[PDB]
Design a protein around this ligand. Structure first.
Ligand SMILES: O=C1CC[C@H](N2C(=O)c3ccccc3C2=O)C(=O)N1
Ligand SMILES: [Zn+2]
Length: 105
């Protein structure tokens, strides 16, 4: 139980070791404007994604941060968001926990 892969395809995405307490917890439960609930795990680092477009501050769940959609770079599944433009840290990834699979390295 050390690496996180895309649930839909198996692409390598992140690692347990890279979880990031933001505001004291790596886990944040949030809703978007369409009411969808997301159980977001914050990671300092991730790979295997494709970050789409340019950042936006609109509706940001994390104060001082702008976001880009993060798709699985292999299959296109929406795995979460990349956050930037903030402070301590400047950047991080917020990934949707139930869209990843955890397993051995
Ligand atoms: O921090 C974030 C990331 C993006 C997220 N978001 C969405 O999930 C979404 C769906 C549809 C229209 C607009 C949005 C939006 O801003 C959101 O609500 N906040
Ligand atoms: Zn995938």
């Amino acid at each position: 139980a050390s690496i996180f892969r895309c649930r839909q395809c198996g692409q390598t995405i992140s690692r347990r070791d890279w979880l990031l307490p933001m505001g004291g917890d790596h886990e944040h439960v949030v809703f978007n404007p369409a009411g969808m609930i997301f159980r977001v795990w914050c990671f300092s680092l991730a790979q295997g994604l494709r970050l789409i477009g340019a950042p936006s501050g609109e509706f940001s769940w994390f104060k001082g941060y702008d976001w880009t959609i993060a798709l699985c770079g292999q299959c296109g599944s929406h795995l979460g968001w990349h956050y930037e433009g903030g402070s301590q840290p400047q950047t991080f990834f917020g990934l949707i926990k139930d869209r990843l699979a955890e397993g051995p390295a």
